[PDB]
Amino acid sequence: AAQTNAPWGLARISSTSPGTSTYYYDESAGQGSCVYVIDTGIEASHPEFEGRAQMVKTYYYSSRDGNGHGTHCAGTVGSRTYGVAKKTQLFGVKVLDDNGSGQYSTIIAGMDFVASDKNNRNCPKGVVASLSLGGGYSSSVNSAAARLQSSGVMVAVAAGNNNADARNYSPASEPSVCTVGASDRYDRRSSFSNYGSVLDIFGPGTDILSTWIGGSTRSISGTSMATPHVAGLAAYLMTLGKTTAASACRYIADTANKGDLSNIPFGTVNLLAYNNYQA
Ligand SMILES: [Ca+2]
């Protein structure tokens, strides 16, 4: 399949080179996989989701995304126009309030929720979780992310936006999950992206067009935007049978575009997520 005039980040993850605008992908498009978006919620009624999104848990008075951030992330995972895995099922877990923040105890509960809830969902091709959130180092937050990954979910987490070593942030610093840094359309490390030996992979994170609340769209930036590119890529690859939840981060790193990014500090991987689709 080919989607012309796609958001630059979609075009980038199916290209060996920057500067193109068509997204190429196998038409299976993540069908039969599931991605949990653990964030501010998802505006499921948005037509861009085509009935494939649903809120499954909230820790607040409503399951509505009153912020937009979670809807944007979900759109990069799996919206029809802005998504990597255009046929995946999307499940929203609202651990962040409408101001975009959440207590670590609530975030931990939401991770353990996903580890159990996947047993209530039909995901024959596999399960992914996208965590575009984080704060300072917490062993409890890291151990929750480790449990989620151990349970058989491909966990993708944002590296953080501190232009610092991700070792000091959670869940970014949990070794066993897939920690995602951000790049821009000219293949630079995004100025704000964290780095360090705990990163597994980079994805597009600067000026990312996706869905927003009120049935809308907008472009925003962050490692929060890079993470769902990787989560959607994992779902896509698991539907194709190329990898599994336990192995997907390594598979993505093995098949990434290697050595092509700029402003990568010494000791940080120079790997950019790539779907290696050949039509
Ligand atoms: Ca890792």
UniProtKB/Swiss-Prot annotation:
Where is the Peptidase S8 domain positioned along the sequence?
A: 7-279
What does the entry list as the binding residues for Ca(2+) 2?
T16, D260
Catalysis performed (reactions): Hydrolysis of keratin, and of other proteins with subtilisin-like specificity. Hydrolyzes peptide amides
EC number in record: 3.4.21.64
What are the coiled-coil residue ranges?
none
Q: Does the keyword Hydrolase apply?
A: yes
Calcium keyword on record: yes
Q: Give the cofactor note.
A: Binds 2 calcium ions per subunit.
What does the UniProt function comment say about this protein? Hydrolyzes keratin at aromatic and hydrophobic residues.
Q: What is this protein called?
A: Proteinase K
Gene that produces this protein:
PROK
Give the fragment's position in the full-length protein.
106 to 384 of 384
